[PDB]
C-alpha cells in the first residue's frame, strides 16, 4: 500500500497521480497542486509547481494516459516560484499559450517579480514565459467542452486568481474551485498596512476574501494542498468527504483570521 502525501512534504517530493472528481485530475507534487481538466477536445492544465517540477508533472500528467500535447491552454493561480515555477518548460512540452491577468504578466516575462509583490525580496527566480494571453479579470478560459471562469484573487500577490469550473460524474456535476492562496504573508520589510506604499492592495485583499467565501463550492482544491486538508479528502490518507459545500466559506474566513493576525503584528511591530 501507498503512504500517501503528508501536509507538511516537501515541494517537489513526487505524488502519484489521482481523480480528484470527474474529468478534474491531480498531477502535482505531495506539496504543491497541479490540475489537468480532461476533454477528448484536449485539456486545460492548472498549475505548474516549482522550478523543479516540470518533468514530475509532465509524467503524470502521461501516467494517467494523458498527452501533454494535448493540452490547448494553461492557467495558474499566482506568480509566485513555487506555483509559476514550471511554466515555461511546460508551454514548451504542450505547445499552448499561458493565461494571466495584467498585474501578474511582469512577473512572468521578467522571472521575478518587483515590489508590488508582498514576498519581492524572498522570490526565487523563475523561466520567463513566452506565450502569455492577457485574461480579463472575469474571464473564461474555453477548450472545446471545457469552461474555466476567472475569479481576480488579488492579495497573498498582485496576480492571483482563483478557478471555477463544472466537472462530471456521469450526470453527477460539481462546482469545483481551485481557489487562490490567500495566506498574508511576505518578506521581511512589506508592510500590509501601509498603504501609502500600495494604495489599496489591502482593501483588494479584503475584497478578495469575500468573493471566494461567496463562490458556490462543492469540491475546494487549493495550491497548497494542506490549506484545504486535501489529503484528507483523496488518496489513501482520505478520511473526510470530498465533498462539502462549507469549504469555500471556511477557507476564506479563516485566511480573513490570519489576515487581522498579521495586521495585530505588523501593528506590534
Ligand atoms: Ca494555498
Ligand atoms: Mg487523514
Ligand atoms: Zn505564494
Ligand atoms: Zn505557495
Redesign the pocket.
Given at each position: 500500500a501507498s503512504r500517501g502525501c503528508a501536509d507538511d512534504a516537501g515541494w517537489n517530493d513526487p505524488a502519484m497521480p489521482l481523480k480528484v472528481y470527474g474529468n478534474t485530475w491531480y498531477v502535482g507534487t505531495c506539496g504543491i497542486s497541479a490540475l489537468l481538466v480532461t476533454s477528448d477536445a484536449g485539456h486545460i492544465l492548472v498549475d505548474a509547481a516549482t522550478p523543479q517540477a516540470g518533468p514530475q508533472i509532465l509524467a503524470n500528467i502521461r501516467a494517467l494516459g494523458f498527452r501533454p500535447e494535448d493540452v490547448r491552454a494553461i492557467v495558474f493561480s499566482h506568480e509566485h516560484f513555487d506555483h509559476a515555477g514550471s511554466l515555461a518548460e511546460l508551454q514548451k512540452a504542450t505547445g499552448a499559450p499561458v493565461y494571466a491577468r495584467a498585474p501578474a504578466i511582469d512577473t512572468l516575462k521578467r522571472g521575478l517579480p518587483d515590489r508590488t509583490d508582498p514576498q519581492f525580496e524572498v522570490a526565487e527566480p523563475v523561466a520567463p514565459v513566452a506565450n502569455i494571453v492577457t485574461l480579463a479579470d472575469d474571464g473564461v478560459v474555453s477548450v472545446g467542452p471545457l469552461a474555466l471562469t476567472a475569479v481576480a484573487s488579488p492579495g497573498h500577490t498582485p496576480g492571483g486568481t482563483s478557478w471555477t469550473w463544472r466537472s462530471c460524474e456521469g450526470d453527477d456535476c460539481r462546482q469545483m474551485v481551485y481557489a487562490?492562496?490567500?495566506?498574508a504573508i511576505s518578506d521581511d520589510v512589506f508592510r500590509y498596512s501601509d498603504d501609502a506604499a500600495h494604495p489599496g492592495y489591502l482593501a483588494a485583499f479584503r475584497n478578495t476574501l469575500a468573493r471566494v467565501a461567496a463562490l458556490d463550492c462543492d469540491i475546494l482544491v487549493?495550491?497548497?494542498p494542506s490549506?484545504?486538508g486535501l489529503w484528507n479528502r483523496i488518496g489513501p490518507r482520505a478520511a473526510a468527504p470530498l465533498m462539502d459545500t462549507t469549504a469555500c466559506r471556511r477557507y476564506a474566513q479563516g485566511a480573513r483570521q490570519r489576515l487581522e493576525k498579521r495586521l495585530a503584528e505588523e501593528a506590534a511591530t
Open positions: 487562490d492562496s490567500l495566506t487549493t495550491p497548497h490549506a484545504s
